[PDB]
Amino acid sequence: SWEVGCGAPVPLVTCDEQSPYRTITGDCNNRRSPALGAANRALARWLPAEYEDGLAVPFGWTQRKTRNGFRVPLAREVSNKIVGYLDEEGVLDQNRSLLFMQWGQIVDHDLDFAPETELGSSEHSKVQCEEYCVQGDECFPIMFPKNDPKLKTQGKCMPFFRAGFVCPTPPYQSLARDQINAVTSFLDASLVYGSEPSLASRLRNLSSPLGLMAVNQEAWDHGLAYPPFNNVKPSPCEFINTTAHVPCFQAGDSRASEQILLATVHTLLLREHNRLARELKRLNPHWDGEMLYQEARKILGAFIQIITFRDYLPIVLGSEMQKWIPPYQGYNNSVDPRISNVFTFAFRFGHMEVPSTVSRLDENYQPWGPEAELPLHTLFFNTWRIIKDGGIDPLVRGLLAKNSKLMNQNKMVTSELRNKLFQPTHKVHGFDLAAINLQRCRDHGMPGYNSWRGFCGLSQPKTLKGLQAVLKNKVLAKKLLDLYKTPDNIDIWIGGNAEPMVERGRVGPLLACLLGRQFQQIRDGDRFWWENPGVFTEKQRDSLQKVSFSRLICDNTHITKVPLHAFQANNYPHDFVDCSAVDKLDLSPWASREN
Ligand code: HEM
Ligand SMILES: *[C@@H]1O[C@H](CO)[C@@H](O[C@@H]2O[C@H](CO)[C@@H](O[C@@H]3O[C@H](CO)[C@@H](O)[C@H](O)[C@@H]3O)[C@H](O)[C@H]2NC(C)=O)[C@H](O)[C@H]1NC(C)=O
Ligand SMILES: *[C@@H]1O[C@H](CO)[C@@H](O[C@@H]2O[C@H](CO)[C@@H](O)[C@H](O)[C@H]2NC(C)=O)[C@H](O)[C@H]1NC(C)=O
Ligand SMILES: *[C@@H]1O[C@H](CO)[C@@H](O[C@@H]2O[C@H](CO)[C@@H](O)[C@H](O)[C@H]2NC(C)=O)[C@H](O)[C@H]1NC(C)=O
Ligand SMILES: *[C@@H]1O[C@H](CO)[C@@H](O[C@@H]2O[C@H](CO)[C@@H](O)[C@H](O)[C@H]2NC(C)=O)[C@H](O)[C@H]1NC(C)=O
Ligand SMILES: [Ca+2]
C-alpha cells in the first residue's frame, strides 16, 4: 500500500548524536526514524482520504457526481444559511480574554501550515481563477448561490486555490493526495525561529555575538523593538494604506502579519528572545554567539510548551483534559509526533472565537483616543496601526481586558470574518472564511462528520432526530441536513463546531477528542519536551515553572498593571495588579562558570 511516502524537501540533513539542541527543520528528534516530525512533508492520516475520483478530486468538483447519492452543498451557501449572524450584541465569552483566542493561533501556527499552491507567478491561472471563475487545474473556486448579495457586488466566485501536495508540486496522478506541512510538528517556537534553515539564519543578527534575533532599524516602540520588515514588494500590508507605506513584519512564519493582534503577541515572543539572550551573556560571558541563540531558543520553546499545556489546554478541553492528556510519564520513541490532516481543521475552532472589534486602551485601561475601537476587517495585514498608531502597549492592554467571542449555535463566525476577509494575493475585503474553510476540507481529505464520530467511538447519527439529540438544537439539525441531506456528508469543520460544548471547556465531544489526541501525541513524542529528563537540569525546570504570559508582558512592555490570570475574563481596576506581585523567571541555574 506504501509507495513509499515519496517526498522532496530539504534535500540534505544528517544528525548530531550528542548535541542538546533541536534542529530548525525538526529532523533528528526521533533517532530511529529521523524525518518523523519534520517540515515540508505530508500531513498524517488517521483515516483514509475521501475523494471523488478516488485519489485527488474533491467532492463537488464535477456536477453529475455525488457523495453517497446526494449533491454536496456549496460552501458559501452552507455558510450563508448556518454560520453568519447580524446581531453582535451579547456574544462575548464571560470567562475568556482575547488572549485566549490569541494564544490559540500562536500554538496552532507553531504546529501546522499547508501552503497554498502557487505554481503561479507572471501568470494567467491566477487570472483565470480571479477573472473568469473557471474551475480546473488548481483553481477550485467558491461559487455564489442564488440571491447572495456578493453577486451584485463582486462577481460569480471567490477565487480559491488548492493546497500543496507531495512527491511533486506539478500536475500528477497516483496514490492518495496528502497535503504538505511547511512547519515543524513540535511545540518548538517554529513561528519565532523559522522552519527552513535558510530563513532561520536571516532573522538573526550575526553582526554581533550576543546571539540576538535581528530587529527593526527604522521603527521603534519606546526603546522596545519590532520584528524586521519583509522588504519584498508587493506587500499585503502596504496595499491597505499606501500613504504610509509600511510593509509586513518578518518572522519565523509567513502569517505573522495576517492580523494586528497576531503581530502583537508575536512581537512579545521576539522581544523575549533578545531579553533572555541578553541576560544570558550577563551570567556567562564566556559563551560564543550560537550558544547564546541556542540556549535562549530552548528556554523560549519551554515557555510556549508550559503555557500551552498548563493554562490553555485545560480551559479549552475541560472535563475531557484528563481523558486525553493524562499526566506525563516520560518519552515514547514509538509515538507519531506529526500533525494529522484533520487537526488542521479541528483546531480552526478558534475562528468562532474572534469578536467583531479590536480595541486599544490607554494607561488606565480606558479607551485610547477618538477611534479606540476598530472593526476587525480594517485590521487584516495592518502594520501601520502599530508602527504609526501608538505601539503595542494599547493592544496588549486590550488583550488582557477585553472578552473574546463565545461560540454560539445561532451566532457562529462574525461577519467581519465571514464577509469582509482580506486575502493577501487579492485586492478586495470580501472573502469568506467560513466558506473558504468548507472547500478546504473537500480539498484536503476529508472524511465526513460520522467517520470522525466513529474514530472517537461516539454516536454516529443517521436521522433528523439522531442529530437533534446530539447538537441539542432542532432548528440547527434541520438546517444542517436540509443542505447535506444525510448526517454523513457534513464537513467536519461545521459538524464538529455545531455540537454544544463539553463541561468547563470551549469545544465539544468530537473536537475535544481530535484535539486531545494530537496534543498528547506531540507531547509524548517530542524528545525535547521540557519535562523529559535530560533536556533541562532539575533546577532549571523549577524556574521554568514560575513563568506566565502575565510576565511575558511585564519584561517586554510598559504595561505595569496586569491580571494574575491572563487567560480568563477579569476587570480593571479590581482583578489587575502590579508587575511586582507576579513571579519572575530566575535565570541563575543557567550559569556555568568555566573553571
Ligand atoms: C482575525 C483572526 C484570524 C484571521 C484573520 C485568520 C486568518 C486565516 C486565514 C486567511 C487562513 C487560511 C485558510 C486556508 O487557506 O487554509 C487561516 C488558517 C488557519 N487558522 Fe486562522 N486566522 C485568525 C485567527 C485564528 C485563531 C485564533 C486560530 C486558533 C485559535 C486560528 C487557526 C487556524 C489554523 C489551524 C489554520 C490552518 C493553518 C494550517 O495550515 O495549519 N486562526 N487563518
Ligand atoms: C545587532 O546587534 C547590534 C548590537 O547590539 C545592534 O546595534 C546596536 O543598536 C543599538 C540600538 O539599536 C544602538 O544604540 C544606541 O544607538 C543610538 C542611535 O543609533 C545612539 O543614540 C546611542 O549612542 C546608542 O549607542 C547601537 O548603536 C548599536 N550598538 C552597537 C555596539 O553597535 C544592531 O542593530 C543589531 N542588528 C539587527 C539587525 O538587529
Ligand atoms: C472561569 O474559568 C476559570 C478557568 O477555567 C475557572 O477556574 C478553574 O477552576 C477549576 C476547577 O477546580 C480548576 O481546575 C482551576 O483551579 C481554575 N483555573 C485556574 C486557571 O485557576 C473558574 O471557575 C471560572 N469562573 C467562574 C465564575 O465560573
Ligand atoms: C494612512 O496612514 C496614515 C498614518 O501613516 C493615517 O494618517 C493619520 O490620519 C489622521 C486623519 O487623516 C491624522 O489626524 C493623523 O495625524 C495621521 N497620522 C499621520 C502622522 O499621518 C491615515 O489616516 C491613513 N489613511 C488611510 C488610507 O486609511
Ligand atoms: C508508547 O505509547 C504507545 C501508544 O500509547 C504504547 O503502544 C501500545 O503498546 C501496547 C503493548 O506494547 C500495544 O498493545 C498497542 O499496540 C499500543 N497501544 C495503543 C492503543 O496504541 C506503548 O505501550 C508505549 N511504549 C512503552 C513500551 O512504554
Ligand atoms: Ca512547531
Side-chain angles (χ1 to χ4, degrees):
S1 62
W2 310 65
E3 292 297 307
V4 102
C6 267
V10 70
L12 284 90
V13 181
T14 297
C15 307
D16 185 325
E17 288 95 325
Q18 293 169 338
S19 70
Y21 303 117
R22 316 172 166 281
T23 48
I24 292 294
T25 59
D27 293 327
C28 313
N29 182 297
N30 188 334
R31 295 187 197 274
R32 181 193 165 266
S33 184
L36 213 72
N40 281 285
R41 303 187 192 277
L43 296 157
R45 295 267 179 186
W46 297 346
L47 281 177
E50 288 194 20
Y51 289 121
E52 181 193 298
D53 77 340
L55 325 152
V57 169
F59 274 110
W61 201 79
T62 67
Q63 301 296 300
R64 75 213 191 215
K65 298 198 182 184
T66 62
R67 188 201 254 154
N68 310 330
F70 302 116
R71 200 183 72 210
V72 289
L74 292 181
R76 173 70 180 161
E77 195 190 341
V78 176
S79 183
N80 278 330
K81 281 175 175 177
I82 286 90
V83 184
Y85 65 91
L86 289 186
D87 199 349
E88 287 293 342
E89 198 66 34
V91 295
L92 303 152
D93 199 317
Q94 288 297 104
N95 204 353
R96 301 286 190 275
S97 66
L98 253 172
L99 183 64
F100 178 64
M101 171 249 172
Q102 206 49 64
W103 192 257
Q105 207 169 14
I106 295 297
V107 172
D108 167 295
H109 285 203
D110 193 317
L111 306 164
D112 38 340
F113 181 47
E116 213 177 43
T117 190
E118 236 60 330
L119 218 87
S121 273
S122 168
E123 157 118 85
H124 20 216
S125 304
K126 302 198 265 188
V127 176
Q128 214 152 76
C129 209
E130 180 103 28
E131 315 277 300
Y132 304 101
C133 288
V134 152
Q135 186 173 355
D137 277 321
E138 303 295 307
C139 169
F140 172 24
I142 315 182
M143 298 298 155
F144 297 129
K146 196 192 206 171
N147 294 172
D148 197 333
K150 305 259 108 168
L151 285 163
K152 296 161 188 205
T153 322
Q154 322 210 344
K156 256 157 201 175
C157 83
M158 295 182 179
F160 173 99
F161 276 81
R162 292 198 75 171
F165 55 122
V166 299
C167 212
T169 193
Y172 234 137
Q173 201 212 248
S174 199
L175 211 61
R177 259 210 204 191
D178 293 298
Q179 277 73 23
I180 205 100
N181 193 121
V183 286
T184 76
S185 319
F186 317 96
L187 264 182
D188 47 352
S190 296
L191 80 171
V192 185
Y193 295 98
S195 292
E196 307 145 338
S198 48
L199 167 85
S201 204
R202 182 199 309 159
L203 298 157
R204 292 182 63 176
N205 193 40
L206 297 186
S207 299
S208 93
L210 294 24
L212 263 53
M213 213 67 61
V215 287
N216 210 305
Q217 304 274 59
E218 326 193 350
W220 286 97
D221 191 4
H222 311 124
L224 299 168
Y226 283 129
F229 288 124
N230 173 29
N231 281 327
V232 71
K233 213 164 284 182
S235 173
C237 302
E238 279 187 1
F239 180 83
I240 68 154
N241 179 331
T242 56
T243 311
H245 22 305
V246 208
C248 306
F249 286 133
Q250 205 174 0
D253 177 76
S254 297
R255 316 171 272 181
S257 292
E258 180 248 319
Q259 153 217 88
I260 304 260
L261 300 177
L262 181 56
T264 302
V265 169
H266 207 142
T267 306
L268 296 170
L269 294 191
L270 190 90
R271 278 187 205 169
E272 184 48 8
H273 174 95
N274 284 348
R275 188 198 66 85
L276 288 172
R278 284 174 214 282
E279 196 77 51
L280 284 182
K281 183 171 164 64
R282 203 183 171 99
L283 307 161
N284 354 80
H286 42 293
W287 286 4
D288 68 299
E290 189 134 8
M291 211 198 164
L292 281 157
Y293 164 82
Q294 287 299 140
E295 280 295 323
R297 188 190 158 206
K298 188 192 283 172
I299 175 165
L300 188 60
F303 173 89
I304 297 180
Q305 291 189 337
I306 301 167
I307 292 190
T308 308
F309 271 75
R310 195 204 59 206
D311 293 344
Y312 177 65
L313 287 186
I315 64 170
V316 174
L317 298 181
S319 309
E320 305 280 310
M321 175 78 178
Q322 297 170 281
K323 184 197 176 76
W324 290 117
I325 317 285
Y328 197 61
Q329 271 197 166
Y331 164 78
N332 208 310
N333 70 336
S334 301
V335 67
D336 199 317
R338 299 147 91 212
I339 310 294
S340 66
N341 196 16
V342 63
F343 187 75
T344 83
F345 293 91
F347 203 13
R348 294 175 200 256
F349 83 85
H351 287 149
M352 311 205 165
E353 293 177 327
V354 198
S356 69
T357 64
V358 166
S359 43
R360 205 184 297 270
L361 298 165
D362 82 340
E363 312 197 47
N364 290 323
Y365 281 73
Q366 268 288 301
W368 189 72
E371 307 181 318
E373 191 178 359
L374 304 172
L376 177 81
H377 84 81
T378 83
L379 301 180
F380 314 125
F381 305 94
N382 193 332
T383 40
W384 81 265
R385 278 286 186 187
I386 73 182
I387 279 101
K388 295 278 192 189
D389 197 37
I392 69 169
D393 277 66
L395 296 163
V396 175
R397 222 169 272 139
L399 289 168
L400 309 167
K402 293 272 182 171
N403 271 334
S404 45
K405 189 189 165 295
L406 200 151
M407 196 296 291
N408 200 303
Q409 290 178 352
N410 279 306
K411 304 189 194 182
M412 294 184 77
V413 175
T414 184
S415 317
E416 295 276 300
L417 280 178
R418 196 194 78 91
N419 271 344
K420 293 160 203 167
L421 179 64
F422 191 89
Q423 202 80 329
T425 320
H426 312 286
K427 292 184 176 67
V428 286
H429 287 261
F431 285 95
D432 183 345
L433 185 54
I436 203 171
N437 276 173
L438 293 160
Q439 285 279 83
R440 195 59 95 193
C441 296
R442 298 158 200 198
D443 174 33
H444 275 250
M446 183 64 69
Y449 174 65
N450 273 351
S451 315
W452 292 106
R453 283 284 293 196
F455 192 80
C456 301
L458 295 156
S459 335
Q460 294 153 253
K462 273 308 158 207
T463 43
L464 201 151
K465 199 152 186 64
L467 204 85
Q468 277 192 178
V470 135
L471 324 179
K472 291 149 90 173
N473 194 294
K474 291 183 195 294
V475 181
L476 177 54
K478 276 180 211 172
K479 285 176 175 168
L480 271 168
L481 49 81
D482 262 347
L483 287 154
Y484 284 115
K485 298 183 71 68
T486 187
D488 283 331
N489 291 355
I490 308 169
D491 297 296
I492 307 182
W493 184 77
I494 192 82
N497 278 110
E499 303 174 332
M501 300 185 181
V502 294
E503 183 171 317
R504 267 279 162 74
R506 296 298 146 186
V507 298
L510 178 40
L511 280 189
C513 166
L514 289 165
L515 281 160
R517 288 203 194 206
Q518 182 77 77
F519 278 108
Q520 160 220 316
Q521 284 185 27
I522 61 173
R523 174 190 72 174
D524 289 1
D526 180 13
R527 191 185 73 174
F528 292 86
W529 182 258
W530 71 283
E531 272 175 324
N532 176 53
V535 287
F536 289 117
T537 264
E538 152 208 302
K539 274 174 80 194
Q540 306 183 317
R541 275 190 289 268
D542 296 5
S543 299
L544 283 165
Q545 279 158 191
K546 303 274 184 168
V547 299
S548 49
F549 192 89
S550 315
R551 257 283 140 186
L552 185 72
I553 53 193
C554 284
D555 301 6
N556 296 303
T557 331
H558 296 109
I559 45 173
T560 42
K561 301 269 170 287
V562 290
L564 210 44
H565 305 269
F567 278 92
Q568 70 188 42
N570 39 18
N571 281 239
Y572 186 93
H574 185 98
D575 299 296
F576 283 71
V577 290
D578 205 87
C579 284
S580 48
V582 175
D583 319 327
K584 311 175 90 153
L585 168 61
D586 200 323
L587 271 154
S588 59
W590 301 71
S592 168
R593 208 162 172 161
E594 171 133 15
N595 262 283

